[PDB]
């Protein structure tokens, strides 16, 4: 058993391009590894406070700015730590909220590198010096301008739910994000950037770094791409175990689990490719093997021991990111395995059930399924398609509304759009169910306006409070039943609903003037006990509320 190097993804590049020079100024495919001794050489005595430095090989940086979403293992992120790069002059942006969203979602410890400090008006570069050193040599007004921009970032982070501060002012390192102002182009601030990473390693990394350097290699494919001279190849990161040139490895394709016997393991040329016999966890490597081509970026990579065990172990990992059930509802489609897992994770996070989740453009069958799910709660009758096009065959068999389609290349916007969409469809529901509820309404029988005594009694009437509807039951001042609103007419208009001080000619079935009903009388809607109870959730105008209590008192004298 060994303790490997933490894997660090960079979100938001000359960062590693000048960091690579850091060490070279004394190789992995898709990654750069900075040995611990080099880190200590760059970080003065600032590191001497972190005891994990004596046990780590160094830091393994993934050369993949963001997919991070593609850098994933069973359960989530393959990265142990992460740097979120923000431009300190431009401040926040969209891709920054998308990254933050993803970082908290996967719960990965991270630091923010407030890049481009060299671009602040009046700043004087001090090549490769720690931030504190260079900052203290700047003019008082230049120092103030950097703190102003930093605090604007602290502000945005706060709106987003993260408390944070410039690294040297952080209180409680576990909950505040540490912001390290830097300049990638210059080496300014890089020392503290690395010290805060060693800082996060000290705070959160233990058993996650333990590997069994002899066990069959556990990795993840980040790129399936052609290469001159060696057709299709695979670039992978190994996080546990050992991979050998003669190994057999299984991986997921878009349809099935396959395996291939490796022909070559290639890495960059030391200090185009260089062949190697093996690689140990904490490695980025290019693989040359036969039946790849349809291999999925983001798929697990496993050297094969037992074909049955490896096969189902891979199948189950993917089973969680697919879902093709019948129940629930909501269809999700992303352009990649990682994205898909991110979206499904966020949705699954919002307890929103899913019926479909897969890769590829929206298809007729996705629309059909959005329908089968629409048949129960139109809130599910939606298609959420992340960075994926809509096949013509489905853009037509989708014409019939009822199934909303959210498109976009940014995940939080789509989610925001979903939630609010659900909001309207959520209000445009109570309402629908409200109509079926008999609201409070009061009515006054205008004197000297009797057009008919019995049969429908018919008289001029004024709406006192609320809204009386055709069919509403009417009762006495003493709770006695009087009749039912048969029909209404305002001047020449036939109505079923009348409010305010409307005044109309009203036909009242079952009522009889100078008997059951009397001119001048005030009649009240005979709301049903149950309907009344539904005052909760369903709750009016300051009048309908006072009236509801009155109807209550009125009936109360009998219950």
Curated annotation (Swiss-Prot):
CDD domains: aeIF5B_II, IF2_aeIF5B_IV, IF2_eIF5B. Residues 115-118 are annotated as: G4. PROSITE patterns: G_TR_2. Residues 3-205 form the tr-type G domain. GTP binds at residues 63-66, 115-118. One of its GO terms (molecular function) is translation initiation factor activity. Coiled coil: none annotated. Residues 63-66 are annotated as: G3. Keywords: GTP-binding, Initiation factor, Nucleotide-binding, Protein biosynthesis. GO terms for cellular component: cytoplasm. The keyword Acetylation does not apply. The keyword Acetylation does not apply. Residues 183-185 are annotated as: G5. InterPro entries: EFTu-like_2 (IPR004161), EFTU-type (IPR029459), P-loop_NTPase (IPR027417), Small_GTP-bd (IPR005225), T_Tr_GTP-bd_dom (IPR000795), TF_aIF-2_arc (IPR004544), TIF_IF2 (IPR015760), TIF_IF2_dom3 (IPR023115). Function in general translation initiation by promoting the binding of the formylmethionine-tRNA to ribosomes. Seems to function along with eIF-2. Belongs to the TRAFAC class translation factor GTPase superfamily. Classic translation factor GTPase family. IF-2 subfamily. This is Probable translation initiation factor IF-2. It comes from Methanothermobacter thermautotrophicus (strain ATCC 29096 / DSM 1053 / JCM 10044 / NBRC 100330 / Delta H).
């Amino acid at each position: 058993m060994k303790i490997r190097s933490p894997i660090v993804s960079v979100l938001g590049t000359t960062l590693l391009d000048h960091i690579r020079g850091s060490a070279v100024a004394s190789q992995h495919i898709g990654a750069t590894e900075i040995p611990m001794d080099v880190i200590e050489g760059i970080c003065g005595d600032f590191l001497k406070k972190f005891s994990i430095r004596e046990t780590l090989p160094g830091l393994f940086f993934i050369d993949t700015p963001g997919a991070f979403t593609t850098l994933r293992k069973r359960g989530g992120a393959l990265a142990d730590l992460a740097i979120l790069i923000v431009d300190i002059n431009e401040g926040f942006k969209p891709q920054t909220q998308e990254a933050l969203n993803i970082l908290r979602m996967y719960r990965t410890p991270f630091v923010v590198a407030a890049n481009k400090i060299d671009r602040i008006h009046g700043w004087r570069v001090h090549e490769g010096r720690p931030f504190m050193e260079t900052f203290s040599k700047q003019d008082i007004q230049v120092q103030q301008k950097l703190d102003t921009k930093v605090y604007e970032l602290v502000g945005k982070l706060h709106e987003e739910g993260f408390e944070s501060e410039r690294f040297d002012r952080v209180t409680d390192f576990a909950s505040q994000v540490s912001i390290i102002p830097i300049s990638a182009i210059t080496g300014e601030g890089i020392p503290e950037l690395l010290t805060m990473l060693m800082g996060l390693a000290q705070q959160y990394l233990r058993e996650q770094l333990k590997i069994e350097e002899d066990s069959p290699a556990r990795g993840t494919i980040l790129e399936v791409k052609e290469e001159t001279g060696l057709g299709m190849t695979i670039d992978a990161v190994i996080y546990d175990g050992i991979l050998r040139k003669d190994d057999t490895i299984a991986m997921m394709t878009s349809k099935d689990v396959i395996s291939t016997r490796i022909r070559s393991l290639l890495k960059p040329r030391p200090l185009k490719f260089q062949k190697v016999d093996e690689v140990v966890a904490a490695a980025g490597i290019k693989i040359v093997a036969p039946g790849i081509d349809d291999v999925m970026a983001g798929s697990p990579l496993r050297v094969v021991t037992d074909p049955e065990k490896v096969r189902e172990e891979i199948l189950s990992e993917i089973e969680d990111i697919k879902i093709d059930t019948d129940e629930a509802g909501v269809v999700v489609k992303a352009d990649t395995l990682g994205s898909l897992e991110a979206v499904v994770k966020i949705l699954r996070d919002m307890y929103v059930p899913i019926k479909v989740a897969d890769i590829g453009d929206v298809s007729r069958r996705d629309v059909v399924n959005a329908g089968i799910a629409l048949q129960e709660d139109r809130v599910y009758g939606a298609i959420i398609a992340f960075n994926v096009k809509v096949i013509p065959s489905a853009a037509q068999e989708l014409k019939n509304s009822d199934i909303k389609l959210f498109q976009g290349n940014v995940i939080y916007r789509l989610m925001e759009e979903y939630e609010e969409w659900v909001r309207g469809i959520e209000e445009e529901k109570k309402k629908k169910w409200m109509e079926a509820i008999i609201k409070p309404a009061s009515i006054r029988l205008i004197p000297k306006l009797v057009f008919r005594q019995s049969k429908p009694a018919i008289g001029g009437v004024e709406v006192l409070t609320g809204v009386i509807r055709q069919g509403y039951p009417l009762m006495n001042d003493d709770g006695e039943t009087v009749g039912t609103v048969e029909s209404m007419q305002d001047k020449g208009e036939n109505l079923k609903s009348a409010s305010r001080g409307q005044k109309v000619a009203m036909a009242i079935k079952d009522a009889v003037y100078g008997k059951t009903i009397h001119e001048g009388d005030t009649l009240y809607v005979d709301i049903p006990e149950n309907h009344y109870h539904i005052l909760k959730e369903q709750l009016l105008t300051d009048e309908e509320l006072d009236l509801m209590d009155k109807i209550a008192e009125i009936k109360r004298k009998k219950n």
